[PDB]
Ligand binder design. Structure first.
Ligand SMILES: Nc1ncnc2c1ncn2[C@@H]1O[C@H](COP(=O)(O)OP(=O)(O)OP(=O)(O)O)[C@@H](O)[C@H]1O
Ligand SMILES: Nc1ncnc2c1ncn2[C@@H]1O[C@H](COP(=O)(O)OP(=O)(O)OP(=O)(O)O)[C@@H](O)[C@H]1O
Lengths: 423, 71, 71, 423
DNA sequence: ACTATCCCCTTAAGGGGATAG
DNA sequence: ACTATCCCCTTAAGGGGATAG
């Protein structure tokens, strides 16, 4: 059965799975002329025919959870004909990231435009522990077709006024809720997100919800936005750097085949805010360094797909500190590596601990990124880390678990030392 | 109309247009004196492509070009 | 605005703009990672000039580009 | 004294002649931002400073008559400080071709916007014979500051209703009047212009005026055009292929240094009607062949300078048949050459008589001009020459001198033979 | 029928690095 | 102070000519 692709109620095209299991996609002659017209993916540009490239499959496979065990977790409840992308997509295909919406052709069913069943203080706790049993994406055995990409345990939800309401119909969620993996990962992030903001980085706000014997992180979605009259909840098109180059989740890490500093930076010259984005992607590199984050795999960077085929970086998201993991085990700062390597002389340095300011300016020297600009990113960190830290510390809830802050705040300063010692 | 900010954005744009008017790389090429390979090249690797080639191709499509602010 | 139909029409156009904002070939070049000779080249022999160079220069001037009909 | 440059009442800039006799020009910060803004010459592009290139001088020198004897003819009446471009330009600088208007800075003098003193049946004859004495451009010793480029004897005039009125003030003329050099050159052209039209070529209409013992050709100007309310007579900006590349009248002929088929054709790819103009310039080449015209020197082709710096070919003009010149003297079709050479194998053929269709397709083969298009220009001439000829013949006035037609019509057919014999 | 490649050849862009006017 | 050239090096556009899918 065909599968149609709409965006904020606008038929963009429709996905097709042939007999020989070949996934194809074709635009809608109509949408290829719409005011809103823009490619579903920079990797599937508007054209008249049927696209038949892996790029088609890759884009849609990257819409489902990264783990082969979670896939099977989904085929549980909903009797999907397989763990095959198309099938699941046909099942839990309504609230994917960005704004793509997959509805079977043979099924108009104008599902709930803006519906939601308010959760009970228990119900909330229920879904927030569906990972304890065998219920993926917190989709308990009680009208839920939401989708999120990634590897950890999560589930997105709606949030109207002061209630965590379960999305009903094709109603978009507003918050991507996360659960405890690394112990208090809910905390590691909530901290990492505050600090990032405090340093002038583009990151979404994040609030942590408590449900008895469980802690869950609730992040606000930068791919959602109320409309003019606070009537419709619109979904902003977007994609992760994997979809862009049309690669499979498989190559997320630069150490598999995924993209890294260069490719990416090159791609940004084509942004509508190129010179600026181009700059922020770098600043961030150096921040991922300081807090030693280690998930900088393509699938963690997103560009907004605007009309006419434009695009710009989306705020940075999902940042977790790989620091609380030192000491207790053999694991030490010398073992920590940066998802994307910066250049060096011996090849390309990729170890946080062995890394020094000089290494960034080397990279910022090849890629042609204004040396004078890199100097400024180093100088600004060299003198705001301290203040950034404290003005944050004095915010964490009086119950925020303490080593997390210490463990994260202390190594960070060590690393920063190299900076001040120069800038 | 749509503001383009890259050779790739450009190619896709012009490709669409040719596709839209049912034109062949071969047609346009013969009208403006450039190789049909040159047009195939332009639609997949527009990063390195003479400005002249740009406008000839641009003329065969019967379009112009203007400069506006990136808002 | 004005419809351009040639690399030369283009150069003059962008030259004017740079001149207008009191910019130097050297300034823009440093911001977008290309040689100031590359910009001098572009303003006198734009016929043969990579599209990429085109847009970088185009970005340093804070302008965009669109495609319209030659009426 | 400075010299200002206005176009249809719009200060574009102002020409300056330093002490060391260096001719300079600078735009007006104001005009460099006007709705109408466009370069005075494709050879002097809008820029902030002072232009100091020969291109400045060349453009303005090409506004005055080509003959060093006529220059002196002008310095006669008006006590110009010299035959130096600037000076004359300051004197008879009001009605030049195109639309440039030069008025001394130190002299606003809102001269007659739309004035004209109707000429008497004699007065007309007067100016039409000013070349017999020592009065250039028919500017007799009675408020006249008109200018025309070229080498033969001419003078432009206004034409309101049914009167040949002498332009008054900066009032633009409407017709470029020509006098008898080649005898009845007034006729050679009037014929050549009719035939050109009849074959679908872009040429201005032309009427011949009679003044007793003198015959004068009156051509309509394609660089003039009434405005909305038939109130203002606007002047359309333009320039000849010499000004374009910023070369001196000296190199008008390809056999001096001037431009030829290629250069020109290349330049046309940048037209706003490139593919079309590009085609017509060729067709014409082949026509200049058939009627054997021999003045195809850069200074005979013009592009309109539109807003934003655009440009397109202007209708072809000034076409005289170098045929009536055979027989009587040693002069024979083998002596006749085409101002601009087309390519060949032995180098570049330039002799009408030795030239055959094959030669054009050779040239149309290098320049990359669609062979299929050249085939069509040859085929259309191959079958309209005859009809074109007759439908014309039956028009010439019952007093039109007969060998001109015969002498021109017969050789033409000979040449055409090669065509039909193939197309 | 239509587009993507290819061997092959010459002219050159553009980055290094850098000075003549 | 600012832009036009330059020696020098590598990668390549684009025209000829032309076929694999
Ligand atoms: N706040 C958000 N707003 C919009 N899109 C988001 C947001 N958070 C996550 N996403 C989207 O979801 C995808 C995965 O999210 P995220 O990186 O948070 O997952 P994880 O933390 O599940 O990932 P991993 O385990 O691989 O590190 C991204 O590709 C991104 O497009
Ligand atoms: N009908 C016209 N409309 C507009 N401009 C014209 C017209 N006739 C001539 N001109 C302009 O005047 C210039 C010379 O005119 P033309 O070629 O008729 O002179 P000539 O016949 O005096 O030339 P030559 O003696 O060199 O062959 C051209 O450069 C052109 O721009």
């Amino acid at each position: 059965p065909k599968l149609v692709t709409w965006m904020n109620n606008q038929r963009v095209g429709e996905l097709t799975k042939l007999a020989n299991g070949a996934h194809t996609f074709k635009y809608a002659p109509e949408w290829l002329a719409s005011r809103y017209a823009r490619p579903l993916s920079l990797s599937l540009p508007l054209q008249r025919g049927n696209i038949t490239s892996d790029a088609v499959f890759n884009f849609f496979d990257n819409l489902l959870p990264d783990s082969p065990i979670v896939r099977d977790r989904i085929v549980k409840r909903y009797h999907a004909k397989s763990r095959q992308p198309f099938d699941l997509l046909s099942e839990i295909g309504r609230d994917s990231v960005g704004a793509v919406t997959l509805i079977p052709e043979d099924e108009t069913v104008t599902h709930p435009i803006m519906a939601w069943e308010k959760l009970t203080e228990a119900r909330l706790e229920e879904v927030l522990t569906a990972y304890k049993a065998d219920i993926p994406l917190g989709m308990i055995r009680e009208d839920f077709r939401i989708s999120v990409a990634g590897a950890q345990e999560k589930t997105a939800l709606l949030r109207i006024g002061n209630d965590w309401c379960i999305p009903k119909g094709i109603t978009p969620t507003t918050h991507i809720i996360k659960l405890p993996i690394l112990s208090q990962s809910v905390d590691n992030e909530y901290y990492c997100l505050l600090l990032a903001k405090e340093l002038g980085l583009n990151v979404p706000d994040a609030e942590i919800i408590k449900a008895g014997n469980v802690r869950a992180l609730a992040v606000e979605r930068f791919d959602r936005r109320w409309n003019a009259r606070r009537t419709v909840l619109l979904r902003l098109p977007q994609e992760d750097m994997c979809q862009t180059f049309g690669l499979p989740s498989s190559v997320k890490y630069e150490s598999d085949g995924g993209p890294g500093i260069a490719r990416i930076m090159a791609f940004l010259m084509g942004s509508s805010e190129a010179l600026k984005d181009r700059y922020d992607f770098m600043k961030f590199q150096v921040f991922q360094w300081l807090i030693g984050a280690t998930q900088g795999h393509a699938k963690n960077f997103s560009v907004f797909i605007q009309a006419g085929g434009s695009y710009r970086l989306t705020p940075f998201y999902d940042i977790i500190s790989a620091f609380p993991v030192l000491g207790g085990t053999g694991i030490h700062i010398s073992d920590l590596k940066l998802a994307m390597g910066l250049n060096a002389s011996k090849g390309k340095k990729t170890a946080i601990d062995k890394i020094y300011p000089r290494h960034f300016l080397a990279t910022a020297k090849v890629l042609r990124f204004p040396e004078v600009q890199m100097h400024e990113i180093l100088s600004d960190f060299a003198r705001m880390i301290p203040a950034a830290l404290d003005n944050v510390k004095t915010s964490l809830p009086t119950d925020f678990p303490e080593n997390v802050v210490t463990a994260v705040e202390s190594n960070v300063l060590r690393l920063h030392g190299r900076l001040s010692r120069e800038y | 109309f749509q503001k383009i900010y890259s050779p790739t954005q450009l190619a896709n744009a012009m490709k669409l247009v040719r596709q839209q008017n049912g034109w062949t790389q071969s047609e346009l090429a013969k009208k403006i004196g450039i190789k049909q390979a040159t047009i195939s090249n332009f639609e997949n690797n527009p990063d390195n492509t003479t400005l002249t080639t740009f406008f000839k191709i641009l003329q065969s499509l019967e379009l112009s070009m203007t400069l506006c602010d990136a808002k």
